[PDB]
Design a protein around this nucleic acid. Structure first.
Lengths: 40, 77, 44
RNA sequence: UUAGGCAGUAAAAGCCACUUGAGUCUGGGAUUUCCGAAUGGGGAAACCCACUUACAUAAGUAAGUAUCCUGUUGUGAAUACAUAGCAACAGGAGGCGAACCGGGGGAACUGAAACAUCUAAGUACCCCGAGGAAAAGAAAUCAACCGAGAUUCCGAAAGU
RNA sequence: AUAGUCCCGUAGUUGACGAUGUGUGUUCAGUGAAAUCGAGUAGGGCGGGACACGUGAUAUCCUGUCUGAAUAUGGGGGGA
RNA sequence: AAUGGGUCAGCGACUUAUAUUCAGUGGCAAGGUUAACCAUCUAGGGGAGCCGUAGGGAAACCGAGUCUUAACUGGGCGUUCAGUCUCUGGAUAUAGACCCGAAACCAGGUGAUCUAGCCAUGGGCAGGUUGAAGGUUGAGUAACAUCAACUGGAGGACCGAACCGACUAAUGUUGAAAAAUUAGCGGAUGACUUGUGGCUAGGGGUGAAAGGCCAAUCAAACCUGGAGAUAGCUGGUUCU
RNA sequence: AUUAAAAACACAGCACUGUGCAAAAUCGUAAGAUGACGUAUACGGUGUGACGCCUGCCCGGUGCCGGAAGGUUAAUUGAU
RNA sequence: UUGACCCUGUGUUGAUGUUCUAACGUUGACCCCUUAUCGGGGUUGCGGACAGUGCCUGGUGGGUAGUUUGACUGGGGCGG
């Protein structure tokens, strides 16, 4: 799942950086807590 | 019932087929799972009984569109 | 010798009565069937 | 509409009427106990017992009072908001019916001169949902380099 | 008792206040309605099912499961 | 002296539809015939189609020939003979397919008013025995332990009615009775018995276990449906 | 129940075995139940069958339990 | 930690182990709906990418089901 980082993450990347993540990571952590968003 | 709230996928019927081609009736159940989706607009979790396919659909369409669709169908969500 | 029919009204009603027939789908099927046949007595 | 009529068994009886209120026929009103989806609650169907509000004054009467779905109003938790919840209101629904229809499930005997693939058969049956019909339907269809022009039903092609 | 002419009818000719039904217009208020030309879609893998067609060299259709485009410069079909 | 028939009367078994084929009959004839449908409707329209008119070859294809083979001296089949559509009949095929008859299989229901087990709530058990533990008072022991007397009232305890049962015999066996009666017999305060109401349901229940019982039925209840299952078997099959 | 009442069944006692509690096990597609408002001195299954004396040899077979090294081996993957 | 591959130690994947929490479980506790040992929601603890379930897949599988188990024969079986 491609996601836009709304903040800096340890390994993923920096704010505004697009990265593929596992859908669990996005669904269950990054997106719910506002650390990223769906890269529509 | 074993019915996906997002898709409508329900248990379908088919055959088991041996090497000897004996057909016994069987069912094919949807890979139903329960998952709590946080819905921002309503500032709540909503627990859905949905297929794993249903989850993929919510990942593409987002929960808000899917909840809308469901409520129209008369799903209690 | 004790024979098979040992009637009690209450047991007759609770088993074969109208309200018993009407309680279940298959009971209602019986009442409808009997009503279709033209049976004077739908229930016991 | 018009000489008789008051259902039959079914006689009697007491009556009514005779040119139109005798009666009859058709339609439309009125009344329409109780049970039954049965719906105020309950219940061994045709019974029992209520609440609310009006009335009555005595210990009654009348009306209203189901559930769900949808919508709208209010209210309204756990935490602010909110939502859930709760209540009111409006509109629906429920049951029955021989077949026809669409859909969800779905046998076996039998045939195969045994039997398991196969057959019977997507039949019987069960379920759900209709409607006067239903369904289908307006080419991401065929055809064959020529062309056709939705769907349905009927005749052939072909027991090919 | 066996009826053209006895009776009830029949052919034909007539009858509706009112109530219904039907079809036309002419209106109204809706519905159609899914909005906006179609993506978790087409296609694919695995398992089944439907197509006369039993998986066969088996096209096409449906999909339980897992995936997954292109997007008129494109896509579907024409029985591997 | 194998079967069936007490008798009479009545009813009771080769059908119907569709298709294939053969025959008779009729029409028309190298042609015959239309189907649905239309129709002022047994007319007439309607030519789609079917059969015949050519065969040979797996086939392309060739064609009074063709196939075989490199090719036949050849050889196979064909050439040279009226069909077709009605009607009637004989057969056949698909259908229950001449009629009647299973044991069974499946589906959906109905049954625990009988019986099995369980659950809850009530009840019953004359009369008579025996005398566990325990206790008490005397002993007795360092204290126990132990002894006697008295008391006490245990027990799937004893005898025996009700009650529950059912070991033997006789009767009965077209019964008084689809399981009894008579004389005896077992249990009889219990793993007892009984009333009322509950619950469990058919490849299911329930079983102190007998395949027992689940409504006089049980190695898979009963009812209805599939269903006219199927029956290479038996019976029966009607005038001259 | 209605041709068998017994030496058959049960039985207390015995033994093996499962079961750590969302127990095993069973009914049920599931939810939910029983087990049990119990908790290994409990619960389930199996056999044996008061009590006394005892209960020998065999682990090849077939169970069951344990062990994993290697060999074989599915979906999957997709090298050539 | 390690295997493959990738390049120039590096990434990309795969295991394996630990740790973690955020999916998921909870038949722990508390709060509310609520007069409720159901359920839902909230909070928290304990677990935790395990379990569990779906699809696929090997094994096991009289627990269950459908069936098969020839004929001749000096009856039939056995033998042939």
């Amino acid at each position: 799942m491609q996601v836009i980082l709304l903040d800096k993450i340890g390994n993923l990347g920096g704010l505004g950086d697009t990265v593929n993540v596992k859908s669990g990571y996005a669904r269950n952590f990054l997106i719910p807590q506002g650390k990223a968003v769906m890269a529509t | 019932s074993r019915v996906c709230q997002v898709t409508g996928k329900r248990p379908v019927t088919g055959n088991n087929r041996s090497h000897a081609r004996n057909a016994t009736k069987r069912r094919f159940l949807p890979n139903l799972q329960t998952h709590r989706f946080w819905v921002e607009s309503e500032k709540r979790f909503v627990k859905l009984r949905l297929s794993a396919k249903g989850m993929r659909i919510i990942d593409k369409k987002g929960i808000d569109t899917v909840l809308a669709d469901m409520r129209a169908r008369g799903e209690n969500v | 010798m004790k024979r098979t029919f040992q009637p009690t009204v209450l047991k007759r009603k609770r088993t074969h009565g109208f309200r018993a027939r009407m309680a279940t789908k298959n009971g209602r099927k019986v009442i409808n069937a009997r009503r279709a046949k033209g049976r004077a007595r739908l229930s016991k």
